[PDB]
Design an enzyme around this catalytic site. Structure first.
Site, PDB file in Angstrom:
ATOM      1  CE1 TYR A  65       0.930  -0.644   4.434  1.00 43.54           C
ATOM      2  CE2 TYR A  65       0.544   1.709   4.267  1.00 43.54           C
ATOM      3  CZ  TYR A  65       1.056   0.627   4.949  1.00 43.54           C
ATOM      4  OH  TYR A  65       1.698   0.810   6.151  1.00 43.54           O
ATOM      5  CG  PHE A  70       0.047   9.019   5.608  1.00 38.88           C
ATOM      6  CD1 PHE A  70      -0.046   7.823   6.301  1.00 38.88           C
ATOM      7  CD2 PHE A  70      -1.000   9.391   4.785  1.00 38.88           C
ATOM      8  CE1 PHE A  70      -1.156   7.015   6.169  1.00 38.88           C
ATOM      9  CE2 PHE A  70      -2.114   8.587   4.652  1.00 38.88           C
ATOM     10  CZ  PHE A  70      -2.192   7.398   5.345  1.00 38.88           C
ATOM     11  CG  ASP A  71       2.577   3.821   5.931  1.00 38.17           C
ATOM     12  OD1 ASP A  71       3.742   3.474   5.642  1.00 38.17           O
ATOM     13  OD2 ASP A  71       1.843   3.166   6.701  1.00 38.17           O
ATOM     14  CB  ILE A  82      -8.790   1.900   9.924  1.00 38.87           C
ATOM     15  CG1 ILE A  82      -8.142   1.948   8.538  1.00 38.87           C
ATOM     16  CG2 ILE A  82      -7.895   2.575  10.950  1.00 38.87           C
ATOM     17  CD1 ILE A  82      -8.151   3.316   7.908  1.00 38.87           C
ATOM     18  CE1 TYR A 142      -5.039   5.014  13.113  1.00 33.74           C
ATOM     19  CE2 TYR A 142      -4.684   5.937  10.938  1.00 33.74           C
ATOM     20  CZ  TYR A 142      -4.434   4.964  11.879  1.00 33.74           C
ATOM     21  OH  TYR A 142      -3.575   3.934  11.585  1.00 33.74           O
ATOM     22  CG  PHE A 179      -4.804   3.727   2.028  1.00 35.17           C
ATOM     23  CD1 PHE A 179      -3.524   3.662   2.543  1.00 35.17           C
ATOM     24  CD2 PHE A 179      -5.820   4.219   2.825  1.00 35.17           C
ATOM     25  CE1 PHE A 179      -3.261   4.081   3.828  1.00 35.17           C
ATOM     26  CE2 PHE A 179      -5.563   4.637   4.113  1.00 35.17           C
ATOM     27  CZ  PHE A 179      -4.283   4.567   4.615  1.00 35.17           C
TER      28      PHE A 179
END
Lengths: 48, 107, 49
Positions: B26, B36-37, B56, B82, B99
């Site tokens: 991902y 961010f990831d 999540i 979140y 994503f």
């Protein structure tokens, strides 16, 4: 800007993209594997 | 909630089942476009078992709709995500998450 | 506020030597067509797509 075509997928092997330019409108159009791409560029500058 | 849009097709026949580990790559981006990831930067696929609640809600439901070899874009609202508390440092409150998920296999 | 760092792949553009345009009195035909066929694509050769 997402555009709708049958069997949407990011360009992959054995894919044929047909690009058409009509300077008169002006318009740019695409076909995917002989299938229309439901989006066009138009009203763009003709400076060059 | 979860909005799934297929970037590349999978087999179309195999879908994650409860109690089945999902192995994915991902890349995580906020709706503004900031990353961010990414599991691919770490070079290690991310493994999570469906229905435990490790990931999540957005991941749970979105990967539920995915198939082996399938690459998809998942849009997850803060409620799934979140939310108001956010992920401190990483994610601001009330942030929609985008994503790019490839479901490599199931195990 | 702070400068951001990330790794990005290089990108290059290739064109044929065809140049077509519209002008008053121009000698150039307006409508044009071409195709591109994809033989091989590696989705993730790097972390970046």
């Amino acid at each position: 800007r997402p555009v709708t075509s049958p069997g949407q997928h990011l360009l992959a092997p054995e894919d044929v993209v047909s690009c058409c330019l009509d300077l008169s409108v002006p318009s740019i159009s695409f076909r995917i594997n002989g299938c229309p791409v439901q989006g066009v560029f138009e009203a763009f500058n003709l400076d060059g | 909630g979860v909005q799934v849009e297929t970037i590349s097709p999978g087999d179309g026949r195999t879908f994650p089942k409860r109690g089945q580990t999902c192995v994915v790559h991902y890349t995580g981006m906020l709706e503004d476009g900031k990353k961010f990831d990414s599991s691919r930067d770490r070079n290690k696929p991310f493994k999570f078992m469906l229905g435990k609640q490790e990931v999540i809600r957005g991941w749970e439901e979105g990967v539920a709709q995915m198939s082996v070899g399938q690459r998809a874009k998942l849009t997850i609202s803060p409620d799934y995500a979140y939310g108001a508390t956010g992920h401190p440092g990483i994610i601001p409150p009330h942030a929609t998450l985008v994503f790019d998920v490839e479901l490599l296999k199931l195990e | 506020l702070l400068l951001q760092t990330n790794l990005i792949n290089y990108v290059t553009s290739i064109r044929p030597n065809i140049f077509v345009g519209r002008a008053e009195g121009s000698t150039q035909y307006g409508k044009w067509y071409f195709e591109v066929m994809v033989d091989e694509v590696v989705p993730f050769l790097t972390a970046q797509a």
